[PDB]
Amino acid sequence: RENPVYEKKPKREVKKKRWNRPKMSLAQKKDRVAQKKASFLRAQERAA
């Protein structure tokens, strides 16, 4: 009842560090499947 006013905590500058994985692009996710197919083919041609 004496001092009810609220004071915001001072803001500290961010170092701009990303903590979570970013979204990979179409080129990356297409190269991934291309090389997956290539790897499977090259493994199977030997395993046979």
Next chain:
RNA sequence: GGGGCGGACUGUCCCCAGUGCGCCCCGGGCGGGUCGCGCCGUCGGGCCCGGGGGC
């Protein structure tokens, strides 16, 4: 399409291969959007701009 810097990720070649991203350097090719200059053409427009036989 290249190089450098930093980094994030993928693949049963993976000691290796491969992809994107932010910055810079790029020698560049492409076209059109804007502006400037030069040249060409107009029985062009400016009462047919201005200078030295017929209406």
